[PDB]
Nucleic acid binder design. Structure first.
Lengths: 124, 118, 230, 230
RNA sequence: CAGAGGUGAAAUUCUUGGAUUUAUUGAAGACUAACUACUGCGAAAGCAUUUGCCAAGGACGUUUUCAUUAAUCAAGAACGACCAUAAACUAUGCCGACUAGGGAUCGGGUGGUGUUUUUUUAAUGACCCACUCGGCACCUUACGAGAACUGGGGGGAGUAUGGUCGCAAGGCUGAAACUUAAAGGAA
């Protein structure tokens, strides 16, 4: 649990597979994997002491296209987890209001624009 | 016009067995495994070793007078992997390329049917 | 050529709207190997047949594995990587390992991982494609990767956590990419050997020798004050 | 140490060919090696215990028997011919793996029946619960009392098909798959039941030899042969 | 006939007194594969081959019977000298005295009126549809004070230290009372 390289590889296994034997260790990680890997590490370090209204700033997207982004992403999520549920496939478990993180989440960089959950419904 | 043996290719990991017997299975014609052709002790399962073993199998089967083989391809089975190693398709390909006609490919690995694990 | 070979799997009903879509790509990817294939949508089956023009004797086996991968619900660009020689399947069996359903689903969810991290790191290290479905584990890959994922999954159904195997896989990759140390044993470098079996109960066995014989007949109950007065 | 020097063991080998019983079509199935007929283990008793596993498609000319391999036991040698008798029947594993689908039940039965000869046979049966046409629920399970009743009528009518057959009559009965049609007709009163099969027939004990009965299964024959010309 | 395991490679091990592979057969101890499910049953731990026996249990059906026999739980009871063993390890959710639903599924019942079934041997199916009762779940909705195998210091992230308790430097070794050999180190 206190191995740092192992746990960093574990939680950055998704975007290494999205933007790739394979390389995982820094001093061998080429561009978009390197930028998003370093950004993920800096977010995870800064989420302890930084304020929750200041650490995860969403990109300013207009209303009628951010809502369509969210609706198409939720359609992808529902189709994926419904296909896996009618198959046998065991999926990882998410919380109640969060978005399920899928391959299009990691490739399309969708969580910078839509967040991890609708925080108005999370607040209410 | 053909004379038929059977192939009995047992392709585990770590080794492959190309073992032509007669139509009953009681009399053998040139069992040569993979680890006896070229042994680095880890290339025994390799497609090169399976091709060498099937090639001199087919040499001795053409010597005795067998023109075709019914292929029975098995894995280690049991309470284990059930998938044929890298040598099974290579031994089959080398048996077909070295003159022998192929018939009746079938998968006779021992599915354990309620096994003895726990 | 050969005489005739014909394999057939049969697929669950929900898959047919996907298989109907991808089916022309299957016919392209097999007609380059001279293998016919039908998709029956009334009996719900997929058959592959060796035609008159098949000079590869062993490719009907990989076509069989391809159609049962399509039945076991891996997608098409993942599943046509089975038609090449360096890649094969494995179907690990995890149902027959532990007794209670709670411990079974918790060890299987441990095999998947938090957010899928353990499973995705395993796919990356072993170069395989792994599906934890139901009470079995499908996997596609090279044979060294298949050996690795089979030992990982079976030891994960036994009690040892899979991130120990992920750690030793990373250690073994960075230990195999040096030219020396390739004929020495790596057991001093692997932290997998824990030596955690270090308890031994040593009581006096007071009741545990022979206590509490079993009788099938119950004792009577303490009656109420109403019963004690009537 | 010192191992051995080779002396070629295919100079002392003798070729026999295997004549199948006349409850089949084309009856030359192949050839068989045995050591040369010397005194102290003659070849005609080095044989007589060998079973061969042939394909019913190869024995019957068609290809709808491409599964369903059978076993022929060598009984009597005459004149470089091995006359065989029926020894068992078995599916290939791929056939019943191609039949098993989830969201149905497999009812399988077996009975140990002694025929009109004194052969005793363990004969099996598999059947899978169909769904009717217009059925919209995805399950089509049997309610397990329908399983017990179906398995009851399976056991009764196939132990009626044996005892009312000899081995030759039973073999000619189960070549054109018609005991399956008897099971289907007798069971459609309970559940629909797709693809009933027999799948496996095992000999357990065999009565005696009766060379006359075997030669009446095949055909006659007796030789006065050559004479030495001095 | 000369190797077989096994490994990332190896090795312990077996093997020309024939291992591994193949075929026939026997014996043993387990286990009940696929079918196998966000299905079933059980008070829970748990329970998967067939057939039979033994008692049991639940839901439904009932214009049967008794007539308050009832609900909750501290206490107590039931279940849970030889051969040596693993459990947890990323998780989740707002609760109850609470309204309605929706789709799917399991067991029973009623009605409909088509297809599989079928006939003067007994009774008995399967599917479709609506309704209804009871379950295992799932997806939602509306509305409520929801108060009155034992041992515990006090937040998270850090920073400084003239206090107290420790651990730690030197400097070629031999080699000090001896400016001392051999040998080694270093450059």
């Amino acid at each position: 649990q206190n191995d740092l390289e192992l746990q960093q590889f574990l939680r950055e296994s998704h975007l290494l597979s999205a933007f790739n034997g394979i390389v995982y260790q820094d001093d061998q990680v080429i561009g978009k994997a390197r930028s998003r890997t370093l950004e993920m590490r800096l977010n995870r370090l800064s989420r302890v002491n930084g304020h929750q209204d200041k650490i995860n700033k969403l990109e300013k997207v207009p209303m009628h296209i951010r809502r369509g982004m969210i609706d198409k992403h939720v359609k992808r999520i529902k189709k994926y987890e419904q296909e896996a549920a009618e198959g046998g496939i065991v999926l990882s478990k998410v919380k109640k209001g969060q978005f399920r993180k899928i391959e299009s989440t990691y490739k399309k960089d969708i969580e910078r624009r839509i967040g991890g959950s609708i925080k108005a419904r999370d607040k209410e | 016009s053909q004379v038929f043996g059977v192939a009995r290719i047992y392709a585990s990991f770590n080794d492959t067995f190309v073992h032509v017997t007669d139509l009953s299975g009681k009399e053998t014609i040139a069992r040569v495994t993979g680890g006896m052709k070229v042994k680095a002790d880890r290339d025994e399962s390799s497609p090169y070793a399976a091709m060498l073993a099937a090639q001199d199998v087919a040499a001795k089967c053409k010597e005795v007078g067998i023109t075709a083989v019914h292929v029975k391809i098995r894995a280690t089975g049991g309470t284990r992997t059930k998938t044929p190693g890298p040598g099974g398709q290579a031994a089959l390909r080398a048996l077909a390329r070295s003159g022998l006609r192929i018939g009746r490919i079938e998968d006779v690995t021992p599915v354990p049917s309620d096994s003895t694990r726990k | 050529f050969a005489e005739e070979s014909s394999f057939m799997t049969l697929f669950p009903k929900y898959r047919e709207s996907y298989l109907k879509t991808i089916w022309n790509d299957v016919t392209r990817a097999l007609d380059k190997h001279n293998i016919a294939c039908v998709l029956d949508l009334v009996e719900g089956s997929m058959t592959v047949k060796t035609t008159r023009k098949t000079y590869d004797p062993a490719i009907i086996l990989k076509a069989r594995d391809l159609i049962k991968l399509l039945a076991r619900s891996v997608p098409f660009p993942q599943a046509v990587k089975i038609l090449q020689d360096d890649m094969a399947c494995d179907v690990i069996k995890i149902g027959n390992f532990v007794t209670n359903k709670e411990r079974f689903v918790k060890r299987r969810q441990r095999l998947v991982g938090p957010n899928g991290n353990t499973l995705k790191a395993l796919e990356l290290l072993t170069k395989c494609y792994i599906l934890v479905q139901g009470n079995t584990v499908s996997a596609m890959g090279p044979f060294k990767g298949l050996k690795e994922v089979r030992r990982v999954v079976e030891d994960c159904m036994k009690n040892i956590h899979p991130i120990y195997h992920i750690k030793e896989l990373m250690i073994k990759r960075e230990l195999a990419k040096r030219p020396e140390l390739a004929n020495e044993d790596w057991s001093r470098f692997l932290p997998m050997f824990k030596k955690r079996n270090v308890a031994r109960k040593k009581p006096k066995k007071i009741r545990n020798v022979e206590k509490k014989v079993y009788t099938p007949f119950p004792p009577a109950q303490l009656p109420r004050k109403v019963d004690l007065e009537i | 140490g010192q191992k051995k020097r080779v002396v070629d063991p295919f100079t002392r080998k003798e070729w026999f060919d295997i004549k199948a019983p006349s409850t089949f079509e084309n009856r030359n199935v192949g050839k068989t090696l045995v050591n040369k007929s010397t005194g102290l283990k003659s070849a005609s008793d080095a044989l007589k215990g060998r079973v061969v596993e042939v394909c019913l498609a190869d024995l019957q000319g068609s290809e709808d028997h491409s599964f369903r391999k059978i076993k022929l036991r060598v009984d009597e040698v005459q004149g470089k011919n091995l006359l065989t008798n029926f020894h068992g029947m078995d599916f290939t594993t791929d056939k019943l793996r191609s039949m098993v689908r989830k969201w149905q039940t497999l009812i399988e039965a077996n009975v140990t029946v002694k025929t009109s000869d004194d052969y005793v046979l363990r004969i099996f049966a598999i059947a899978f619960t169909r769904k009717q046409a217009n059925q919209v629920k995805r399950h089509s399970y049997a309610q397990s009392s329908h399983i017990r009743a179906i398995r009851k009528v399976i056991s009764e009518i196939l132990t009626k098909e044996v005892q009312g057959s000899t081995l030759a009559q039973l073999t000619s009965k189960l070549i054109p798959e018609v005991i399956n049609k008897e099971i289907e007709n007798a069971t459609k009163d309970i559940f629909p039941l797709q693809n009933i099969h027999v799948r496996k027939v095992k000999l357990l004990k065999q009565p005696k030899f009766d060379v006359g009965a075997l030669m009446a299964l095949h055909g006659e024959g007796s030789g006065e042969e050559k004479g030495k010309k001095v």
